[PDB]
Symmetry: D2
Subunit: 386 residues, 4 copies
């Protein structure tokens, strides 16, 4: 069972299943993958659609004639299979010109170029019907201190995004932006390192309602952070416009393991949160089938992403629906957490003797939280041992 279907809204980037397997210490182990192939092979697995960077669909340096040809092939493949394109993004990290950044490159010409390159693909995104546009500034950062004044770099970043919002507004476009944070790699330190930082930045943009976050499992885990907590904060602020699902095993280089791999329990809690919140965005995977795999392994790995999600979905549902679990929830006063602290006004609080003078701290401290029993119920469910 656990067979995924387009109704599950699973999506993959063409750069994922399309990863040739090139790493810092080794060359490609797989041949390039024709976007049409990736479209057809994914639809067959039950995927809902695909996402792409501009350079994944249209080769860099392509002519206006060649560009039109590449999109036609991709279009015909999307129409025949019924696959959609919910999200689009720009590649502002691969080319040598972006070695010092894109929107925050010290050189002004590079920055202007970055914007124009992004704008052209935003138009293409709209045509393909993409409603979300991700921006991952992997080259926005530094390796040394004096090399980048962060404040000036942030001003440039705000200016870049404001211009981007102004553009979609003047064109009457129906597309929002999703900023994807990353603590490091490819840069020593990357600006807007976590979901928290991206969220904060968005608040100082001219039109904030147009920007959200595109958190990625591996990225936040590269800072040893709790992913579902991060995501919880993004939902709390209504800023979760898109998400990247994968696996990461600890603080180290981005491994982009298939969703489910890496921190299993963190993947379980994530699914729990997304389902319980009713999040409606596509479940997009940004992973890289290990370079040890051949083309058949790539498809196995991609199928694994969706499978693990559905498995966790089921287990998380059973956990929350379990009468004994719900009972354990009340025992850990999770219900009181959802109750306002002082809906009786600040004045009533200051006069409430039960809130200070008559509060029996010792009695309160002696009461166990009962989290461990609760957690083992979650473990039994995850492992199917109940």
């Amino acid at each position: 069972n656990y067979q995924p279907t387009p109704e599950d809204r699973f999506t993959f980037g063409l750069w994922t299943v399309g990863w040739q397997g090139r790493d810092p210490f080794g060359d490609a182990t797989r041949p390039a993958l024709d976007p049409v192939e990736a479209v057809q092979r994914l639809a067959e697995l039950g995927a809902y659609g695909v996402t792409f960077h501009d350079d994944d669909l249209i080769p860099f340096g392509a002519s206006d004639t060649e560009r039109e040809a590449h999109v036609k092939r991709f279009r015909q493949a999307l129409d025949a299979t019924g696959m959609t394109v919910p999200m689009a993004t720009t590649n502002l990290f691969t080319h040598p010109v972006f070695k010092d950044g894109a929107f925050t490159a010290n050189d002004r010409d590079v920055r202007r170029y970055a914007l124009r390159k992004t704008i052209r693909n935003i138009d293409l995104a709209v045509e393909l019907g993409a409603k979300v546009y991700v921006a991952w500034g992997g080259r926005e950062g530094a390796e040394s201190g004096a090399a980048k004044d962060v404040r000036a770099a942030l001003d440039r970043m705000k200016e870049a995004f404001d211009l981007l919002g102004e553009y979609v507004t003047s064109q009457g476009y129906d597309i929002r932006f999703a900023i994807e944070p990353k603590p490091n790699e490819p840069r020593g330190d990357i600006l807007l390192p976590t979901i928290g930082h991206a969220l904060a930045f968005i608040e100082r943009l001219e039109r904030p309602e147009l920007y959200g976050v595109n958190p990625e499992v591996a990225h936040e885990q590269m800072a040893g952070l709790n992913f579902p907590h991060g995501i919880a904060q993004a939902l709390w602020a209504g800023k979760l416009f898109h998400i990247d699902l994968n696996g990461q095993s600890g603080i180290k280089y981005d491994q982009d393991l298939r969703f489910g791999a890496g921190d299993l329990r963190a993947a379980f809690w994530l699914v729990d949160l997304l389902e319980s919140a009713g999040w409606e965005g596509p479940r997009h995977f940004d992973f890289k089938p290990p370079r040890t795999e051949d083309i058949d392994g790539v498809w196995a790995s991609a199928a694994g992403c969706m499978r693990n999600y559905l498995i966790l979905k089921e287990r998380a549902a059973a956990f929350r629906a379990d009468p004994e679990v719900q009972e354990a929830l009340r025992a850990a006063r999770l219900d009181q957490l959802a109750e306002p602290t002082a809906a009786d006004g600040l004045q009533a609080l200051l006069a409430d003797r039960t809130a200070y003078e008559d509060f029996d701290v010792d009695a309160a401290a002696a009461r166990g939280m009962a989290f461990e029993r609760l957690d083992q119920l979650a473990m039994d469910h995850l492992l199917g041992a109940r």
Copy 2:
């Protein structure tokens, strides 16, 4: 040389040099330090002021009698020595009643007590002249996934902070709140884990202008983040209300080494940023003299904090004054970073062929950023090897 004076505005929390040496695997190695002894000794080292947790000054459960008697001896030492109290904070983490949190404890009765305990210290802070009130939610968090629903926790956290802001207002108090982020410890994962999460949170509060952040070197470093970068984003938004300086040697338990120890270069870039930005806040130290040290070792450590800051301040300044460094900065285009990307507007950028069609990417890609020579000049300055 490098003798500190009140003019430098150095402040130490009473719990720093007052730490008895108790850690997870050992008992105290030093006797409790009398707050009066702390004030006197610090003033002798050149300190400017001291900070405190309500429980650092007044024992828990103490009666109003013993209460006023403690603040009496304190005020008496500050007046005689000339030390001031710039900041005051609450201790909502030691008492077992706060084992599951304070503002976000699942038990409602505990959350209300947390607000009353804080409020009572907010009055003492104002009575003592302190205009900055720090809030470190060390117990706000969880060890397990279902033990806490972050969205719900954040709602209770917003409520608590709103009520606190409402209180200072109704009282016409001239005080501001500074939220102290932290990724983990003592809780498995702490809410508002980094400077960014704290920033994003405040913007969702009822009166944002009343809250800021109090980042600590060790905290951001426990998530392997670039403290200077995060500090810059705080300043960028003008939310750096307070700061805790100390040392950390990588991702591990919070070490609270004296400032300068741990990541030395990061400390250097921090001073560089704070001084070049003209931040007028006091340089507060929140460290812990190793339990291996006796009372004299404590004062030596405290002196080390200030000494290292003054030494770095001198080196950072000479770095920025050196005409050779200035030239190296221009060679790396740090000046263009400050210049607007598109001062003339969106429609101008779109129609600018130099920003796309006729932009020689390869020519711009061949330009070295000259960051390495720039950074080695910084190294020579820090090391006094110019």
Copy 3:
């Protein structure tokens, strides 16, 4: 179901379920637990035996008499319950006298004292039947560079262990030592930080055959290391004399979560390894029920330790016994890995054209490893989604 029994050989440290919950930020949340009470409670859960630090059974400083009165109760509870004492260890980290270390303390008198203390609990260890004596150098280390010359510290450390081995040999004792590695905490950096340094260190002791390692899941993970891999190297060397099972959520302070919690998959591969290797050592738990828990939570947490190990044992055995998995294993060539590289020798290899000249590198490079399908089968087994 999954009810554990004494046959499973599960053991717990008295300090585990007996932890009062006192972290470096808060006071204890639970009263002290009587050792006798621990044996009885653990016996009912299905535990096989218990372990202890000298200070967990005898008040520090007790005389010949009181010391004896204490061993009588415990032992009386052992015979009555049928619980055993497979291992004992020394507490050379709590008393403020070991703030700079025990065997590697700079003060000679402290080092000598450390040996006498350890040696006296070795006689007790044997008196109680424990044939394994663990050694965890928690205070062996430093926070600063000149505070500890590691070469001298190792000379001292080696002498201590050599003396201990000479002593057990002179007494004709049938006991072995298990050195327990740790990266940091309570010291900034701890000597012999991982399983490898301990194994290497042991090879320079006078009687290497007498010492082994007692790795802990949490400790190794504090260095972002693969615990199952480390155990594999210990097993390969025949040096896995004991083991500490628990959970850890990434690089940070020692959490000591219950076994199964933290990195779930690492836990799984670890049980897979120990079971497939046929390791006959006791499955010992060194964890700490979160301080948020009451006495009921303590037992719930201890129960989870064994439960989780039992579930994983069944899932790992099912995985290995699955015909489809054995198929994927061959497809991935795990069988060839176990085959010798050059059975016929070096000269035959130098003369073998298939090893160089006529070696079709590309054909071999295009060969898929099929690790993903293998790993997803492992994931379905673990989640009971087969």
Copy 4:
């Protein structure tokens, strides 16, 4: 000033300054560098010699003739400049054939091919005068648990290294191997992740005396460890056959910053140890000038490696020669650390009352270690203050 000279014995890998700037998310930003140019440029900067991967000097695919040619050119550049080649290593990680490992690849054919490739370069090494042969199993490891049975891997690894040892011995060659540890990258987990693991492995090899370790700064720091401490154990065991100097800014992907960068103070303690231990090995640099740098940045970065080492060398020497520091050392009892714990022997220790019953443990605990004053004097020297 701090001008390097061949007398300092500084060496560089050809792949270092020769790094084209390619990373997981970007193309090269610098053209291929002729090995002749590197040698000429380095000799001009004050370098003493260079090291290389077989494939750095002789491109893969080359014939005996082309190979003969490449070597000839290299040799004459070496004779002209006077540069030497102290160490040689094999590239067993770039070609897709090694995606699953070399000596421990699952496929036997790959394993044999790997050894022939190594053996062939070992001969070239002896010809070039290389006395040390480094080995970095960057591909020896895995991303999933069932993909690799570590024990079997270690068996193949032992078998491979024993075969190499049998070859050097039978050939009468004068060369020893140096195993390079690395926690991860490019593999999820790499076998022999640290100095400790590598040292433990060597002891089980047939001819241990022929193998030592080649520890790298970044590598150990990618596991959050203290490199100087690891070096101290390597030197303690007399197994430091080579070393890779560079910088790393915390737990993250391998940065290979120039030596001095990253953890500055750890670099200081590193030089202090190497200098005081009197290690006569060459100070080899394995770094990568940032891709943001052009050809000129490359040389400026490489000169920075030597420069920083010489600066730290001088500061550490001063620190140790400083009478005030020698006093501080005595006060922190570093002298007693070097004194045998029990020279009077075991039995005399057992009968010594002052070592146990008559030991004033309280009086000892209160004796401060005076580590902080000692470290600040170390800080002051490093920073050129005093």
